[PDB]
Amino acid sequence: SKPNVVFVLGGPGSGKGTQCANIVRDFGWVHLSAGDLLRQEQQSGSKDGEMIATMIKNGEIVPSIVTVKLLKNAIDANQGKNFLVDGFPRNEENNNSWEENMKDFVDTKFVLFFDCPEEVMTQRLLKRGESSGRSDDNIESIKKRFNTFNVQTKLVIDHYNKFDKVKIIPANRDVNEVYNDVENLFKSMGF
């Protein structure tokens, strides 16, 4: 059987990583955060390491050739699992590179979009920046991430939305109120 994939999209700090951990716990899917995979590769001392570092700091999207490879390696090592790919696709290139490399290998079911206001994401991110130790949790990078989201990623969401493949969860609530709807959706989808 081909894996099922759900793209988990949303703004910076909309809660994609938080809710994905809940889904892993209750449904046993594998959580692939693209942001985490890219950081990991950078921590590993690769060729692409100093490039990844600069782009993350400035809220730019890394070349897909790096990201899709990192996702494919993890997916190929976990035969028989379903996948939450978190924070991807974030632009058209991301999307095209996915469909070029993955389309006959997986079943991408829907985009789960966490909708949250910028003001709330900014606050969540400054708070997370006190302990995360991420290079992009400050208020310079945060605002760069917002622009990239607005200019590149919103187009991807509306592209899936015309094929009816976006589910929207409003994310400006308690973490458990948000998870209740997420759990209900995954149950209603037969997972």
Ligand X SMILES: Nc1ncnc2c1ncn2[C@@H]1O[C@H](COP(=O)(O)OP(=O)(O)O)[C@@H](O)[C@H]1O
Q: Binding site for a ribonucleoside 5'-phosphate: what residues are annotated?
A: 39, 60-62, 87-90, 134, 145
Numbered residues of the known binding site for CMP: 94
| DSSP, res 78 | S
Shortest reach from residue 76's CB to ligand X, in Å: 24
With CB under 6 A as the contact rule, the residue among 16, 31, 145, 167 that binds ligand X is: 16
> Residue 126 to residues 129, 134, 165: CA-CA distances in angstroms?
5, 11, 32
Integer-rounded Cα radius of gyration of the chain: 16
CB of 17 to Mg ion, least distance (A): 3
Smallest gap from residue 144 Cβ to ligand C5P (A): 8
Smallest separation, CB 35 to ligand C5P (Å): 2
- Alpha helices in 58-138, H assignment, sequence order: 64-76, 92-101, 118-128
Closest CA to 137 of 191, 80, 57, 30: 57
Residues at the annotated binding site? Answer: 13-18, 39, 60-62, 87-90, 94, 128, 134, 145, 173
Main-chain dihedrals φ then ψ at residue 107, nearest 5 degrees: -115, 95
Per-residue tokens: 157: 């969401």
Does residue 129 touch ligand X according to CB under 6 A?
A: no
Integer Cα distance of 105 and 107 in angstroms? 7
14 touching ligand X, by CB under 6 A: yes
Residue 38 interaction partner, one of Mg ion, ligand X, ligand C5P, none, beta carbon < 5-8 Å per kind = ligand C5P
Q: Which of 3, 6, 15, 62 binds ligand X (CB under 6 A)?
A: 15
